[PDB]
């Protein structure tokens, strides 16, 4: 398993614009378009990202290209952030993916903000980290997903994804 397979399972794939659980417009594999209430605006963002008049509808290839770009950006965000990079560097290949998963979902900034969990991961205090991560609005609003990611951190296996 790898990060792409993982996030595809976590985000799913929608080829039409949709309101997500928070009411934000989104498309493809977890690609946020806009946090704004206007479908118009989302439509506009979408055509700008794709480069054509989509009418809120895209192809699988188009979605996968967005995803690739999004995964790329999550990694760059990690390597760029002073707080995240040392942690990422200290982890193994499986746990690095759980970290990217979080950065993909919430942004470099959002993740850099989990100060205590970050420190625990760095120290390889897996169980503590897991407990700390679950005490969050993240977990409460995305329980099953969050549980998979935390489990992955905890065990350093892909078991939660089978
Ligand atoms: Cl884009
Ligand atoms: Co969410």
From Swiss-Prot:
Phenotype when changing residue 117 to V: 50-fold decrease in enzymatic activity
Q: What induces it?
A: Expressed late in the viral replication.
Stated consequence of mutating residue 132 to M/F: 2-fold decrease in enzymatic activity
Name of this protein: Endolysin
Segment forming the signal sequence? none
Superkingdom, natural source: Viruses
> What's the main place this protein lives?
host cell
Consequence of substituting residue 117 to F? 10-fold decrease in enzymatic activity
- Outcome, altering residue 11 to Q: Complete loss of activity
- InterPro entries referenced in this protein's UniProt entry, alphabetically: Endolysin_T4_type (IPR034690), Glyco_hydro_24 (IPR002196), Lysozyme-like_dom_sf (IPR023346), Lysozyme_dom_sf (IPR023347), Phage_lysozyme-like (IPR052619), T4-type_lysozyme (IPR001165)
The effect of pH on activity is described as: Optimum pH is 7.3.
Intracellular or extracellular location(s): Host cytoplasm
- Gene encoding the protein: E
Q: Name one Pfam family in it.
A: Phage_lysozyme
Q: What is the effect of changing residue 117 to I?
A: 500-fold decrease in enzymatic activity
Q: Which organism is it from?
A: Enterobacteria phage T4
């Amino acid at each position: 398993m790898n990060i792409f397979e993982m996030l595809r399972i976590d985000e799913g794939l929608r080829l039409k614009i949709y309101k997500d659980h928070e009411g934000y417009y989104t498309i493809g594999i977890g690609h946020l378009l806009t946090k704004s209430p206007s479908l118009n605006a989302a439509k506009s963002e979408l055509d700008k990202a794709i480069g054509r008049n989509t009418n809120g509808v895209i192809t699988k290839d188009e979605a996968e290209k967005l995803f690739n770009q999004d995964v790329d950006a999550a990694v760059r965000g990690i390597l760029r952030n002073a707080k995240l990079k040392p942690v990422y560097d200290s982890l193994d290949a499986v746990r690095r993916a759980a970290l990217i998963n979080m950065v993909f979902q919430m942004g470099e900034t959002g993740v850099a903000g989990f100060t205590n969990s970050l420190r625990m991961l760095q120290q390889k205090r897996w169980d503590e980290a897991a407990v700390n991560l679950a005490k969050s609005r993240w977990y409460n609003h995305h329980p099953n997903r969050a549980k998979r990611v935390i489990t992955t951190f905890r065990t350093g296996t892909w078991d939660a994804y089978k």
